[PDB]
Amino acid sequence: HTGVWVGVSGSETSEALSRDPETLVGYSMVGCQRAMMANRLSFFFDFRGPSIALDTACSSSLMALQN
Amino acid sequence: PEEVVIAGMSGKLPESENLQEFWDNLIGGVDMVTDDDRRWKAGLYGLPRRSGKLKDLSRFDASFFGVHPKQAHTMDPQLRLLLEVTYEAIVDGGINPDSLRGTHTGVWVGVSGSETSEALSRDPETLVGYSMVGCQRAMMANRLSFFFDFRGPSIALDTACSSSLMALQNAYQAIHSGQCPAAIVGGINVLLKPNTSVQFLRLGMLSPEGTCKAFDTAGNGYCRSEGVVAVLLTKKSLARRVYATILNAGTNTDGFKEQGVTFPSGDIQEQLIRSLYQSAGVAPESFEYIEAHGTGTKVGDPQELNGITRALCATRQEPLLIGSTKSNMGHPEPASGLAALAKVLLSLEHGLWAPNLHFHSPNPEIPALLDGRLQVVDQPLPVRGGNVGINSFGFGGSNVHIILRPNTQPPPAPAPHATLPRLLRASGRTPEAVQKLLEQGLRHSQDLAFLSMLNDIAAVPATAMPFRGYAVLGGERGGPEVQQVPAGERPLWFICSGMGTQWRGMGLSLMRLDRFRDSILRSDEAVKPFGLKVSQLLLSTDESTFDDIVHSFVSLTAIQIGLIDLLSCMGLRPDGIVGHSLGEVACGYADGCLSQEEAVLAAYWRGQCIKEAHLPPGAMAAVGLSWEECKQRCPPGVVPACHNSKDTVTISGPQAPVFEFVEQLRKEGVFAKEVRTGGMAFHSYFMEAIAPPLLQELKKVIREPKPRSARWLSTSIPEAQWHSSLARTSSAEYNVNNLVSPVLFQEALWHVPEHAVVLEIAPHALLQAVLKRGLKPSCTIIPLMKKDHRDNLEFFLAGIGRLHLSGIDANPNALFPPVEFPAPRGTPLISPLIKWDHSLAWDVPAAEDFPNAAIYNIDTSSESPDHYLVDHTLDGRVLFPATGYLSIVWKTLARALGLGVEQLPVVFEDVVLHQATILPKTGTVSLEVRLLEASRAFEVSENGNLVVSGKVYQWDDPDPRLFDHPESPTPNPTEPLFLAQAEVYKELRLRGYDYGPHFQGILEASLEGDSGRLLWKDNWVSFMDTMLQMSILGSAKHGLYLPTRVTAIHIDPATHRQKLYTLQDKAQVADVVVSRWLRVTVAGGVHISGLHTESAPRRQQEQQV
């Protein structure tokens, strides 16, 4: 039932990879959206617990640890 | 732990400014997903034509929420709407936000996009620093916590498509474990950047038809929809209204799956549901309606529905209702959970289930639908009873699920206190808000829970909300009254009136109020020994009953103590107290220096000693003569009894001298009236004879004196001697002297601050006129009771309302019995009632801002502004005019220099056309223009192929001499005949030019082709093409000739305006001249030199056979 809590506060890569509308590949949103920062880990490691990505404004890591 | 409940709710879902509109759309079946161009021009990038969208993002009550205007512009629309929605939600459950301040309430907000962060951070040089404070995704929760002063956790989850329900689950765990006593869960999603929709389309999730045809055979995708919902979850102890109770909530992740990261798993969902309903202790048969995710995906729907079938439909008999809210409003990606919760709670509130749109052929892969074990809500079905479920499955693999037990508290049985009138008070930003609240309250004059909730949330300081208003419900009369409340804290004063104010059955109406009845009953107990029952006296209807002094005094005291108690219940502590003669004792109680029994006994014994004396008859009258003038005018035996006012005075004495003086004064014309003393001398030497027995009795009555406070100003001891022993304590001696001593009432008034609020605590406001006259004009007065009124309870409530309008906060709910909680189901929602101040427009990001060298798309659709180009047909196919190239390059240059077209005289040089662009009948063609300011050269390209090249630059010094019409090649044609429009375009048709009405702009032409008059329909393309038509008209070369090179062109709009003229009709015309010797064509304000045309092939396919 292991869970994942990831403290993240930026997705600049998502902004970069969505620059062009004609030539943007769909699977970018699988691999750059903020939510996937935890869902990808849950997917590879086969964890059935919670999966969360929280900003919390510069205390994301220690917040995730508290959760 | 403790039960957790969904206290409040609020939001702005698609096509709904408040949840009331949301329910009205849902039950009415109206599809909430539109096809307008609000967010971006429809049909772009192949994106779905239809999507759900809010109504207006450009409104925000900036001043109230303490955001300075500059930072208001640069704040994400999500947060601007979310502050309002959260405030509305908190007050929905009838909880004043100030109460939560200082508590550990949290704010869990589910946001998946920060599109506005990019929008305000795309220009490094001129980007303002405020953006981070109001746009960074973390500030979504921090801003709420900062305004409402919440000390609990402040997070912002990011799981996609499930952030809202995950936030709700986290809040449930927080409150359930006792960490937090309240929580504000919310979700926000606004569609601004089309690139995100393009991404989703590339992934394959979006349905081209733009309809989330949930559970149907033809399920394709989901239509993006935007909403902002918030919910307030608090423990069962603090709740006012309980929409539902959260029995349990949990979540789990899909983990590895063979199909892929984006393939939902049914086994995990079944496990989650079973684990929740087993752990919580809820029987599987209990569930009634489950709000399946219903994304409409061909894959997700069968998986989720089969999971629900295994988890709940295994061993139950009655069918289980299954519905999906996304079939109405679309799919709010990160706010999906809260939208479904709002739908479920509204359905529970109103007693019906909202039907599901777009369900005609049930899907075959879900057997339960065909076997009837699951039933879709195709029509509005009445809610039957039982638990409810909700589940959102974000595509990242995060699953959540919540069990809800509806609130079913029945309306209370009618009670006598329901018949009695109630008071209502509402506050808001603008008068429309107060009127809305009062009107809605008046529409429910019987829902006591609704009225109490409204009264609770009305306590807000004037600065926050500058308009208040009160309305008495159920009274014989009296409408709403809303007036602005001037700023500043204002003082409150009590003034207790004296003798004469008693009347028949006074106060009989107030006895229906419980607190007043308790006060009067305590008084009746207090005065038992002497055979007088205050309640019995009040009820007694004999007119002579109040002839005796004893009854009058006791009754006045009892009524005043009752009124002081009634005010005391509301929490009002007076700052100043100034009484008048008898009833100063009432003031004594008001301060606290006297006990109710002590005061009533003092009053009774004063009265009784009055009788025992048997003093000679004596009448006191009001004399218009002032206090200084009257005294020296007073005859022997008469003196100034009470210095009521400068204009009004009272003097007493033997009845005969009083009558003689009154008649003499009436001869002099001054005011005079005898007060109802009943024949007992008041505040004169007559009372001197009573002091010894009265002093004895009073010493008996009050045994443990108390010290008078600085609030109450002794209107019996002159201001000079306020440091005496008597003035310190209102002992028996103080009251004795007060009885004997004159009434220096007016003098004591001055110390009333400015703007202060005066209350006349007494049965009959006899002194209200006196206070008005002798008080600062800035003050405010209130009677609280009027003689011989229909229902004094109504008047008292009206007075409390007027007090509310005057600044102080006196909540009236406490007057009647407290209403049992939680609020019964059916109480109309309070969230829609709140109205904000939306008189300013705040900025929102535009499509242009988001990233995706002038590009001009030419569309010939009838709605397109370039439809006029459909009339430029040469040899049977539409071609883009050369003048069109000139015009687009001109506009691009104008944009480069910053000026407008009509103020930019331009010069073209060495213009060359390479290939002719054919506008297709359908679709569009894109044209690209690039300028090289340094080299004064431009270039037009299409699909990467050069179409036109040349030099364009601004004209520094225009010369009107240039447009003077050149000498005609034939000085004297001397031919009255001339070609008209029909003949001109007949000739051009014969050559091969097929021009439509728009491009037909040659009203006349000379036979030789040298001069003519051109129309001006306010379109440069048509005008210059008409000039080229004139040039081609005189050519002796049969065949289709098209321009290929123009050496130089000069355009000066000012000369163009000065050259035009109007005919007998309203049409404008500009003369045109062609000179083949100089090779110039001058018309209006256009000069064309060095044209060159090359014979077109003139070959067209599919010629008529």
JSON list of N, CA and C in Angstrom, two decimals, chain B residues 386-430:
[
{"chain": "B", "resi": 386, "resn": "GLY", "atom": "N", "xyz": [-31.33, 6.37, 1.84]},
{"chain": "B", "resi": 386, "resn": "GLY", "atom": "CA", "xyz": [-30.16, 5.54, 1.97]},
{"chain": "B", "resi": 386, "resn": "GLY", "atom": "C", "xyz": [-28.89, 6.31, 1.71]},
{"chain": "B", "resi": 387, "resn": "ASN", "atom": "N", "xyz": [-27.77, 5.60, 1.84]},
{"chain": "B", "resi": 387, "resn": "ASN", "atom": "CA", "xyz": [-26.46, 6.23, 1.69]},
{"chain": "B", "resi": 387, "resn": "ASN", "atom": "C", "xyz": [-26.18, 6.55, 0.23]},
{"chain": "B", "resi": 388, "resn": "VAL", "atom": "N", "xyz": [-25.12, 7.33, 0.01]},
{"chain": "B", "resi": 388, "resn": "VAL", "atom": "CA", "xyz": [-24.74, 7.80, -1.31]},
{"chain": "B", "resi": 388, "resn": "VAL", "atom": "C", "xyz": [-23.24, 7.64, -1.48]},
{"chain": "B", "resi": 389, "resn": "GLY", "atom": "N", "xyz": [-22.79, 7.55, -2.73]},
{"chain": "B", "resi": 389, "resn": "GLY", "atom": "CA", "xyz": [-21.39, 7.40, -3.02]},
{"chain": "B", "resi": 389, "resn": "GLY", "atom": "C", "xyz": [-20.93, 8.39, -4.07]},
{"chain": "B", "resi": 390, "resn": "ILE", "atom": "N", "xyz": [-19.61, 8.58, -4.11]},
{"chain": "B", "resi": 390, "resn": "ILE", "atom": "CA", "xyz": [-18.97, 9.48, -5.07]},
{"chain": "B", "resi": 390, "resn": "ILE", "atom": "C", "xyz": [-17.56, 8.97, -5.31]},
{"chain": "B", "resi": 391, "resn": "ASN", "atom": "N", "xyz": [-17.10, 9.07, -6.56]},
{"chain": "B", "resi": 391, "resn": "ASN", "atom": "CA", "xyz": [-15.75, 8.62, -6.88]},
{"chain": "B", "resi": 391, "resn": "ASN", "atom": "C", "xyz": [-15.23, 9.33, -8.11]},
{"chain": "B", "resi": 392, "resn": "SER", "atom": "N", "xyz": [-14.02, 9.86, -8.02]},
{"chain": "B", "resi": 392, "resn": "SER", "atom": "CA", "xyz": [-13.31, 10.47, -9.14]},
{"chain": "B", "resi": 392, "resn": "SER", "atom": "C", "xyz": [-11.99, 9.75, -9.33]},
{"chain": "B", "resi": 393, "resn": "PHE", "atom": "N", "xyz": [-11.69, 9.37, -10.58]},
{"chain": "B", "resi": 393, "resn": "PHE", "atom": "CA", "xyz": [-10.52, 8.57, -10.91]},
{"chain": "B", "resi": 393, "resn": "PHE", "atom": "C", "xyz": [-9.63, 9.35, -11.87]},
{"chain": "B", "resi": 394, "resn": "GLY", "atom": "N", "xyz": [-8.72, 10.14, -11.32]},
{"chain": "B", "resi": 394, "resn": "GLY", "atom": "CA", "xyz": [-7.81, 10.90, -12.16]},
{"chain": "B", "resi": 394, "resn": "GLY", "atom": "C", "xyz": [-6.96, 10.00, -13.03]},
{"chain": "B", "resi": 395, "resn": "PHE", "atom": "N", "xyz": [-6.66, 10.48, -14.24]},
{"chain": "B", "resi": 395, "resn": "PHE", "atom": "CA", "xyz": [-5.98, 9.64, -15.22]},
{"chain": "B", "resi": 395, "resn": "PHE", "atom": "C", "xyz": [-4.55, 9.31, -14.82]},
{"chain": "B", "resi": 396, "resn": "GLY", "atom": "N", "xyz": [-4.00, 10.00, -13.83]},
{"chain": "B", "resi": 396, "resn": "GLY", "atom": "CA", "xyz": [-2.69, 9.62, -13.34]},
{"chain": "B", "resi": 396, "resn": "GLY", "atom": "C", "xyz": [-2.68, 8.32, -12.57]},
{"chain": "B", "resi": 397, "resn": "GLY", "atom": "N", "xyz": [-3.84, 7.73, -12.32]},
{"chain": "B", "resi": 397, "resn": "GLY", "atom": "CA", "xyz": [-3.94, 6.52, -11.54]},
{"chain": "B", "resi": 397, "resn": "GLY", "atom": "C", "xyz": [-4.32, 6.71, -10.09]},
{"chain": "B", "resi": 398, "resn": "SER", "atom": "N", "xyz": [-4.73, 7.91, -9.69]},
{"chain": "B", "resi": 398, "resn": "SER", "atom": "CA", "xyz": [-5.11, 8.20, -8.32]},
{"chain": "B", "resi": 398, "resn": "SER", "atom": "C", "xyz": [-6.62, 8.12, -8.19]},
{"chain": "B", "resi": 399, "resn": "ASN", "atom": "N", "xyz": [-7.09, 7.22, -7.34]},
{"chain": "B", "resi": 399, "resn": "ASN", "atom": "CA", "xyz": [-8.51, 6.98, -7.14]},
{"chain": "B", "resi": 399, "resn": "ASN", "atom": "C", "xyz": [-8.93, 7.47, -5.76]},
{"chain": "B", "resi": 400, "resn": "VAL", "atom": "N", "xyz": [-10.10, 8.11, -5.69]},
{"chain": "B", "resi": 400, "resn": "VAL", "atom": "CA", "xyz": [-10.67, 8.55, -4.43]},
{"chain": "B", "resi": 400, "resn": "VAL", "atom": "C", "xyz": [-12.13, 8.12, -4.39]},
{"chain": "B", "resi": 401, "resn": "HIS", "atom": "N", "xyz": [-12.70, 8.15, -3.19]},
{"chain": "B", "resi": 401, "resn": "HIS", "atom": "CA", "xyz": [-14.05, 7.65, -2.98]},
{"chain": "B", "resi": 401, "resn": "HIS", "atom": "C", "xyz": [-14.59, 8.08, -1.63]},
{"chain": "B", "resi": 402, "resn": "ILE", "atom": "N", "xyz": [-15.82, 8.59, -1.59]},
{"chain": "B", "resi": 402, "resn": "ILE", "atom": "CA", "xyz": [-16.40, 9.17, -0.39]},
{"chain": "B", "resi": 402, "resn": "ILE", "atom": "C", "xyz": [-17.81, 8.64, -0.21]},
{"chain": "B", "resi": 403, "resn": "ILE", "atom": "N", "xyz": [-18.14, 8.29, 1.03]},
{"chain": "B", "resi": 403, "resn": "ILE", "atom": "CA", "xyz": [-19.48, 7.83, 1.40]},
{"chain": "B", "resi": 403, "resn": "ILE", "atom": "C", "xyz": [-20.18, 8.95, 2.14]},
{"chain": "B", "resi": 404, "resn": "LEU", "atom": "N", "xyz": [-21.39, 9.28, 1.71]},
{"chain": "B", "resi": 404, "resn": "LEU", "atom": "CA", "xyz": [-22.14, 10.40, 2.26]},
{"chain": "B", "resi": 404, "resn": "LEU", "atom": "C", "xyz": [-23.48, 9.90, 2.79]},
{"chain": "B", "resi": 405, "resn": "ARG", "atom": "N", "xyz": [-23.82, 10.31, 4.00]},
{"chain": "B", "resi": 405, "resn": "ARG", "atom": "CA", "xyz": [-25.10, 10.01, 4.61]},
{"chain": "B", "resi": 405, "resn": "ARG", "atom": "C", "xyz": [-25.95, 11.27, 4.62]},
{"chain": "B", "resi": 406, "resn": "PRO", "atom": "N", "xyz": [-27.01, 11.35, 3.82]},
{"chain": "B", "resi": 406, "resn": "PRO", "atom": "CA", "xyz": [-27.76, 12.60, 3.72]},
{"chain": "B", "resi": 406, "resn": "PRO", "atom": "C", "xyz": [-28.33, 13.04, 5.05]},
{"chain": "B", "resi": 407, "resn": "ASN", "atom": "N", "xyz": [-28.56, 14.35, 5.17]},
{"chain": "B", "resi": 407, "resn": "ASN", "atom": "CA", "xyz": [-29.19, 14.93, 6.35]},
{"chain": "B", "resi": 407, "resn": "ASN", "atom": "C", "xyz": [-30.70, 14.97, 6.15]},
{"chain": "B", "resi": 408, "resn": "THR", "atom": "N", "xyz": [-31.43, 14.40, 7.10]},
{"chain": "B", "resi": 408, "resn": "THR", "atom": "CA", "xyz": [-32.87, 14.24, 6.98]},
{"chain": "B", "resi": 408, "resn": "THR", "atom": "C", "xyz": [-33.58, 14.66, 8.26]},
{"chain": "B", "resi": 409, "resn": "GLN", "atom": "N", "xyz": [-33.20, 15.82, 8.79]},
{"chain": "B", "resi": 409, "resn": "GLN", "atom": "CA", "xyz": [-33.86, 16.34, 9.98]},
{"chain": "B", "resi": 409, "resn": "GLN", "atom": "C", "xyz": [-35.19, 16.96, 9.60]},
{"chain": "B", "resi": 410, "resn": "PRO", "atom": "N", "xyz": [-36.31, 16.46, 10.11]},
{"chain": "B", "resi": 410, "resn": "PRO", "atom": "CA", "xyz": [-37.62, 16.95, 9.66]},
{"chain": "B", "resi": 410, "resn": "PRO", "atom": "C", "xyz": [-37.91, 18.33, 10.23]},
{"chain": "B", "resi": 411, "resn": "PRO", "atom": "N", "xyz": [-38.76, 19.11, 9.57]},
{"chain": "B", "resi": 411, "resn": "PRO", "atom": "CA", "xyz": [-39.13, 20.42, 10.09]},
{"chain": "B", "resi": 411, "resn": "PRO", "atom": "C", "xyz": [-39.74, 20.30, 11.47]},
{"chain": "B", "resi": 412, "resn": "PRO", "atom": "N", "xyz": [-39.44, 21.22, 12.37]},
{"chain": "B", "resi": 412, "resn": "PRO", "atom": "CA", "xyz": [-39.99, 21.13, 13.73]},
{"chain": "B", "resi": 412, "resn": "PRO", "atom": "C", "xyz": [-41.49, 21.33, 13.72]},
{"chain": "B", "resi": 413, "resn": "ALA", "atom": "N", "xyz": [-42.15, 20.69, 14.67]},
{"chain": "B", "resi": 413, "resn": "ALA", "atom": "CA", "xyz": [-43.58, 20.89, 14.81]},
{"chain": "B", "resi": 413, "resn": "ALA", "atom": "C", "xyz": [-43.85, 22.36, 15.16]},
{"chain": "B", "resi": 414, "resn": "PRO", "atom": "N", "xyz": [-44.96, 22.92, 14.68]},
{"chain": "B", "resi": 414, "resn": "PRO", "atom": "CA", "xyz": [-45.21, 24.34, 14.92]},
{"chain": "B", "resi": 414, "resn": "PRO", "atom": "C", "xyz": [-45.25, 24.67, 16.40]},
{"chain": "B", "resi": 415, "resn": "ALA", "atom": "N", "xyz": [-44.77, 25.85, 16.74]},
{"chain": "B", "resi": 415, "resn": "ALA", "atom": "CA", "xyz": [-44.72, 26.31, 18.12]},
{"chain": "B", "resi": 415, "resn": "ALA", "atom": "C", "xyz": [-45.34, 27.70, 18.24]},
{"chain": "B", "resi": 416, "resn": "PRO", "atom": "N", "xyz": [-45.85, 28.05, 19.42]},
{"chain": "B", "resi": 416, "resn": "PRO", "atom": "CA", "xyz": [-46.44, 29.39, 19.58]},
{"chain": "B", "resi": 416, "resn": "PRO", "atom": "C", "xyz": [-45.47, 30.51, 19.26]},
{"chain": "B", "resi": 417, "resn": "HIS", "atom": "N", "xyz": [-44.19, 30.35, 19.60]},
{"chain": "B", "resi": 417, "resn": "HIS", "atom": "CA", "xyz": [-43.20, 31.38, 19.32]},
{"chain": "B", "resi": 417, "resn": "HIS", "atom": "C", "xyz": [-42.95, 31.55, 17.82]},
{"chain": "B", "resi": 418, "resn": "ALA", "atom": "N", "xyz": [-43.44, 30.63, 16.99]},
{"chain": "B", "resi": 418, "resn": "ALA", "atom": "CA", "xyz": [-43.41, 30.86, 15.55]},
{"chain": "B", "resi": 418, "resn": "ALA", "atom": "C", "xyz": [-44.38, 31.96, 15.15]},
{"chain": "B", "resi": 419, "resn": "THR", "atom": "N", "xyz": [-45.51, 32.08, 15.85]},
{"chain": "B", "resi": 419, "resn": "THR", "atom": "CA", "xyz": [-46.49, 33.10, 15.52]},
{"chain": "B", "resi": 419, "resn": "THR", "atom": "C", "xyz": [-45.93, 34.50, 15.74]},
{"chain": "B", "resi": 420, "resn": "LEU", "atom": "N", "xyz": [-45.09, 34.67, 16.76]},
{"chain": "B", "resi": 420, "resn": "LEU", "atom": "CA", "xyz": [-44.61, 36.00, 17.11]},
{"chain": "B", "resi": 420, "resn": "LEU", "atom": "C", "xyz": [-43.72, 36.57, 16.02]},
{"chain": "B", "resi": 421, "resn": "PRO", "atom": "N", "xyz": [-43.68, 37.89, 15.88]},
{"chain": "B", "resi": 421, "resn": "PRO", "atom": "CA", "xyz": [-42.82, 38.50, 14.87]},
{"chain": "B", "resi": 421, "resn": "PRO", "atom": "C", "xyz": [-41.35, 38.27, 15.15]},
{"chain": "B", "resi": 422, "resn": "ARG", "atom": "N", "xyz": [-40.57, 38.23, 14.08]},
{"chain": "B", "resi": 422, "resn": "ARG", "atom": "CA", "xyz": [-39.13, 38.08, 14.15]},
{"chain": "B", "resi": 422, "resn": "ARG", "atom": "C", "xyz": [-38.46, 39.25, 13.44]},
{"chain": "B", "resi": 423, "resn": "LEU", "atom": "N", "xyz": [-37.23, 39.54, 13.84]},
{"chain": "B", "resi": 423, "resn": "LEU", "atom": "CA", "xyz": [-36.44, 40.59, 13.24]},
{"chain": "B", "resi": 423, "resn": "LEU", "atom": "C", "xyz": [-35.38, 39.98, 12.34]},
{"chain": "B", "resi": 424, "resn": "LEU", "atom": "N", "xyz": [-35.07, 40.67, 11.25]},
{"chain": "B", "resi": 424, "resn": "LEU", "atom": "CA", "xyz": [-34.04, 40.22, 10.33]},
{"chain": "B", "resi": 424, "resn": "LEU", "atom": "C", "xyz": [-33.10, 41.37, 10.02]},
{"chain": "B", "resi": 425, "resn": "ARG", "atom": "N", "xyz": [-31.81, 41.06, 9.92]},
{"chain": "B", "resi": 425, "resn": "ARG", "atom": "CA", "xyz": [-30.82, 42.05, 9.56]},
{"chain": "B", "resi": 425, "resn": "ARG", "atom": "C", "xyz": [-29.82, 41.42, 8.61]},
{"chain": "B", "resi": 426, "resn": "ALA", "atom": "N", "xyz": [-29.48, 42.15, 7.55]},
{"chain": "B", "resi": 426, "resn": "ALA", "atom": "CA", "xyz": [-28.51, 41.69, 6.57]},
{"chain": "B", "resi": 426, "resn": "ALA", "atom": "C", "xyz": [-27.54, 42.82, 6.25]},
{"chain": "B", "resi": 427, "resn": "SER", "atom": "N", "xyz": [-26.34, 42.44, 5.85]},
{"chain": "B", "resi": 427, "resn": "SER", "atom": "CA", "xyz": [-25.31, 43.40, 5.50]},
{"chain": "B", "resi": 427, "resn": "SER", "atom": "C", "xyz": [-24.62, 42.96, 4.21]},
{"chain": "B", "resi": 428, "resn": "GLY", "atom": "N", "xyz": [-24.09, 43.93, 3.48]},
{"chain": "B", "resi": 428, "resn": "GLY", "atom": "CA", "xyz": [-23.46, 43.61, 2.21]},
{"chain": "B", "resi": 428, "resn": "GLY", "atom": "C", "xyz": [-22.72, 44.79, 1.65]},
{"chain": "B", "resi": 429, "resn": "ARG", "atom": "N", "xyz": [-22.05, 44.55, 0.52]},
{"chain": "B", "resi": 429, "resn": "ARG", "atom": "CA", "xyz": [-21.21, 45.57, -0.09]},
{"chain": "B", "resi": 429, "resn": "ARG", "atom": "C", "xyz": [-22.05, 46.72, -0.64]},
{"chain": "B", "resi": 430, "resn": "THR", "atom": "N", "xyz": [-23.07, 46.41, -1.41]},
{"chain": "B", "resi": 430, "resn": "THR", "atom": "CA", "xyz": [-23.85, 47.41, -2.12]},
{"chain": "B", "resi": 430, "resn": "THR", "atom": "C", "xyz": [-25.32, 47.24, -1.78]}
]
